[PDB]
Amino acid sequence: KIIVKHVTVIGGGLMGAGIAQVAAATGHTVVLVDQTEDILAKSKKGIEESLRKVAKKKFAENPKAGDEFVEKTLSTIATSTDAASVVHSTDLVVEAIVENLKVKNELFKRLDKFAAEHTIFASNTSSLQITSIANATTRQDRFAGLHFFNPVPVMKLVEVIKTPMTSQKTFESLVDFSKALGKHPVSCKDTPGFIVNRLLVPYLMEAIRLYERGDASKEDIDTAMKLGAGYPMGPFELLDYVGLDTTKFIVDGWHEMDAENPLHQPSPSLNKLVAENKFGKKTGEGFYKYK
Amino acid sequence: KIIVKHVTVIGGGLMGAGIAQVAAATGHTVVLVDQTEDILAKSKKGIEESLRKVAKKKFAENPKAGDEFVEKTLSTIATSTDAASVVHSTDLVVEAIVENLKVKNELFKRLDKFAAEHTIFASNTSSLQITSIANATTRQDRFAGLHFFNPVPVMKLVEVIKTPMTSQKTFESLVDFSKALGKHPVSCKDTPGFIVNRLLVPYLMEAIRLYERGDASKEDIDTAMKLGAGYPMGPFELLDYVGLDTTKFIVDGWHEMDAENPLHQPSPSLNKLVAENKFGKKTGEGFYKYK
Numbered sequence: 151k152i153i154v155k156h157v158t159v160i161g162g163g164l165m166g167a168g169i170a171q172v173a174a175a176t177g178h179t180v181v182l183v184d185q186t187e188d189i190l191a192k193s194k195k196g197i198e199e200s201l202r203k204v205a206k207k208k209f210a211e212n213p214k215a216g217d218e219f220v221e222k223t224l225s226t227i228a229t230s231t232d233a234a235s236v237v238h239s240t241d242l243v244v245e246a247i248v249e250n251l252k253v254k255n256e257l258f259k260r261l262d263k264f265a266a267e268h269t270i271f272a273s274n275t276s277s278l279q280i281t282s283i284a285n286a287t288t289r290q291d292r293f294a295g296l297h298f299f300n301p302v303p304v305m306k307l308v309e310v311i312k313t314p315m316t317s318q319k320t321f322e323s324l325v326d327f328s329k330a331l332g333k334h335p336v337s338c339k340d341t342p343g344f345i346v347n348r349l350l351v352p353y354l355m356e357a358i359r360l361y362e363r364g365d366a367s368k369e370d371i372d373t374a375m376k377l378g379a380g381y382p383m384g385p386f387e388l389l390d391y392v393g394l395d396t397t398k399f400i401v402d403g404w405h406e407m408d409a410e411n412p413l414h415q416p417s418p419s420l421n422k423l424v425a426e427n428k429f430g431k432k433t434g435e436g437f438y439k440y441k
Numbered sequence: 442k443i444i445v446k447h448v449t450v451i452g453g454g455l456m457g458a459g460i461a462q463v464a465a466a467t468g469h470t471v472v473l474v475d476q477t478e479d480i481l482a483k484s485k486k487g488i489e490e491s492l493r494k495v496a497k498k499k500f501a502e503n504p505k506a507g508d509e510f511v512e513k514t515l516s517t518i519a520t521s522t523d524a525a526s527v528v529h530s531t532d533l534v535v536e537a538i539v540e541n542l543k544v545k546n547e548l549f550k551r552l553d554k555f556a557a558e559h560t561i562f563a564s565n566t567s568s569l570q571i572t573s574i575a576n577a578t579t580r581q582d583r584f585a586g587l588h589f590f591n592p593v594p595v596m597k598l599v600e601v602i603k604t605p606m607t608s609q610k611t612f613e614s615l616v617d618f619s620k621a622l623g624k625h626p627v628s629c630k631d632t633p634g635f636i637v638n639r640l641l642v643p644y645l646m647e648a649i650r651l652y653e654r655g656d657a658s659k660e661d662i663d664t665a666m667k668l669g670a671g672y673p674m675g676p677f678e679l680l681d682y683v684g685l686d687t688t689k690f691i692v693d694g695w696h697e698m699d700a701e702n703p704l705h706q707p708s709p710s711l712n713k714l715v716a717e718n719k720f721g722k723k724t725g726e727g728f729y730k731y732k
């Protein structure tokens with residue numbers, strides 16, 4: 151019954167940064183890891199900006215409390231360029247790097263050698279099979295999926311995915327951790343896309359196909375879903391928000407898995423944007439242009 | 442260039458009652474038509490409850506002005522079980538009856554004979570082809586789709602569907618009417634499901650399939666979509682809200698016109714509930730039970 155206190159977050163992008171922020175904000179000792187010092191410095195800057203927005207609203211009537219919250223949370227987030235140098239004394243690894251099985255397996259296979267014996271490994275993968283990543287290590291009993299939603303400081307859901315090998319002890323530690331982060335964990339089977347993505351992604355692809363067919367504009371489709379279905383974001387706004395590169399990798403993976411399935415037919419428009427390095431908000435342009 | 446003032450609504454169910462309510466609340470004279478006097482009484486009763494709520498929240502600090510508002514709105518709503526006589530002179534007929542092509546065509550073919558020449562005909566159909574229903578009359582230039590969203594008193598979207606035969610004047614009158622109702626019109630092509638349903642319905646069916654596959658409970662799927670995607674309602678709650686009978690009709694229709702398309706594959710669970718007359722909130726029970 152290990153109580154997660156030290157968390158190593160690998161990847162400081164859209165999700166990793168958010169996971170580190172919330173873990174640190176809730177009293178956990180955090181080490182954020184990424185490829186270079188510049189990337190980490192940028193992630194840190196992003197987290198600070200996010201924290202201040204949280205502070206302006208959560209501590210609107212107490213600026214000092216706001217200052218202390220921002221400072222305390224940031225000081226709880228250490229940074230390192232090599233996770234292997236950190237894991238020998240961490241309680242939990244939360245991987246949030248590129249959505250690519252080979253790269254994730256290579257990462258975990260290496261960390262498995264450096265991590266303390268009690269260290270739990272968790273992947274924030276959007277569409278890959280947890281069992282496949284777990285077998286890249288010899289620590290399957292302490293391996294599971296811990297899937298957060300974008301943006302992490304706001305979305306309450308956390309899908310907890312056990313593989314047939316995950317131990318009850320590992321599962322309960324992750325459920326307890328989820329609640330410690332102030333989230334609402336939902337245990338899910340290790341099936342492609344788990345719950346949310348399995349239903350959300352195919353829908354987003356259909357939105358793109360409707361647009362490519364020339365049936366309607368991206369603008370009207372977004373307006374229609376927000377005003378007709380009550381969605382916070384139209385599909386194209388959400389696609390850019392999630393990241394077009396990540397979306398493409400998700401669908402390519404499933405497509406390869408089930409080539410004839412209409413749900414996973416690649417989109418020429420999506421592939422072209424990704425090929426042109428227009429990944430959405432994270433690059434300043436996706437289906438739409440941003441600042 | 443007709444300005445819609447007198448409106449005839451055929452069908453006093455979930456959508457018809459809502460359309461009558463908003464048109465009347467915005468100053469139009471309305472005649473709500475249905476099959477029996479008991480159905481109309483229930484429809485008008487429901488509109489009153491919706492108004493009592495629209496009042497307590499729009500005339501909270503002014504109780505008396507609230508009652509006057511409710512009374513005056515209900516008064517501007519006449520009822521009748523004889524559409525043929527009512528349409529002799531009306532500016533617009535908005536049909537909101539059972540989602541069944543044959544039944545809708547039979548209705549409009551007949552009314553086309555009793556309505557004044559300037560009268561515009563519009564269908565609130567969820568998934569049928571406007572061109573198909575229009576050709577059941579000889580008033581195609583004055584026929585179009587006017588699709589509202591559930592609940593009508595809340596959802597701002599209205600899809601305005603032109604057929605290749607709809608005149609610009611008819612289109613404009615419907616756009617003006619939509620805005621008069623305080624709605625946000627979006628012109629859509631006459632493609633199956635237009636924008637919202639083409640994307641929404643297949644998603645609702647996928648949610649059912651995930652449940653039927655035994656991968657997750659309806660409760661967790663709803664929790665996951667709300668907490669992970671920020672949706673107002675989980676798919677199962679929305680299905681019951683929309684009506685399981687209507688959902689089934691929509692899908693069976695698309696299935697018939699494209700039997701080899703796996704996306705329109707009917708659901709055994711959905712058919713069973715409909716067969717047992719459990720249509721959701723409508724009947725007090727659908728996937729979930731309601732008090």
Ligand SMILES: CC(=O)CC(=O)SCCNC(=O)CCNC(=O)[C@H](O)C(C)(C)COP(=O)(O)OP(=O)(O)OC[C@H]1O[C@@H](n2cnc3c(N)ncnc32)[C@H](O)[C@@H]1OP(=O)(O)O
Pocket residue numbers: 200201203204207275276277298299300301303304305347350382383388392669670671
């Ligand atoms: C691909 C996978 O594997 C899994 C995935 O995650 S799929 C994608 C799942 N995520 C979604 O679908 C997101 C859908 N969109 C939404 O729910 C909302 O648009 C949203 C949560 C992103 C916020 O949008 P919004 O309503 O316009 O909020 P915004 O106007 O941006 O800010 C207002 C509120 O949001 C908060 N906020 C938004 N982004 C924030 C962030 N990054 N950090 C902290 N706070 C933030 C503010 O604190 C604020 O609080 P107040 O209301 O008190 O002012």
Ligand SMILES: CC(=O)CC(=O)SCCNC(=O)CCNC(=O)[C@H](O)C(C)(C)COP(=O)(O)OP(=O)(O)OC[C@H]1O[C@@H](n2cnc3c(N)ncnc32)[C@H](O)[C@@H]1OP(=O)(O)O
Pocket residue numbers: 378379380491492494495498566567568589590591592593594595596637638641673674679683
């Ligand atoms: C099949 C097709 O052809 C097309 C279709 O329509 S598909 C279905 C489209 N509709 C949707 O997707 C529904 C999605 N769900 C929603 O957007 C929301 O859940 C909802 C609008 C139904 C309301 O949800 P909610 O947040 O729980 O609100 P609720 O708690 O029910 O009531 C709160 C507000 O809604 C209003 N409201 C809800 N139902 C109402 C009604 N029938 N009449 C008047 N007001 C109502 C209240 O007046 C209230 O105002 P306040 O916030 O100021 O108090």
Ligand SMILES: NC(=O)c1ccc[n+]([C@@H]2O[C@H](COP(=O)([O-])OP(=O)(O)OC[C@H]3O[C@@H](n4cnc5c(N)ncnc54)[C@H](O)[C@@H]3O)[C@@H](O)[C@H]2O)c1
Pocket residue numbers: 160161162163164165166183184185189245246247248249250253257274275276277297298299300391392393396432
């Ligand atoms: N974008 C979303 O909405 C969403 C939500 C939940 C889960 N996910 C999943 O989370 C993961 C993270 O995606 P993201 O949106 O944050 O992407 P991102 O592109 O914003 O960030 C990824 C980060 O990973 C780093 N990285 C790449 N390879 C690495 C390696 N070998 N070692 C260390 N760091 C490495 C990159 O430098 C980058 O900062 C993916 O598996 C994705 O499918 C994303």
Ligand SMILES: NC(=O)c1ccc[n+]([C@@H]2O[C@H](COP(=O)([O-])OP(=O)(O)OC[C@H]3O[C@@H](n4cnc5c(N)ncnc54)[C@H](O)[C@@H]3O)[C@@H](O)[C@H]2O)c1
Pocket residue numbers: 451452453454455456457474475476480536537538539540541548565566567568588589590591682683684687723
């Ligand atoms: N349920 C939704 O969320 C939604 C939203 C938009 C559009 N629609 C579409 O709107 C239509 C209305 O559906 P609904 O949810 O209000 O269903 P409903 O079952 O609640 O209401 C239909 C009403 O039609 C009446 N009716 C049937 N045949 C009639 C006839 N010949 N003359 C007069 N009245 C007749 C019924 O007595 C009933 O009161 C359908 O075509 C549906 O696809 C439904």
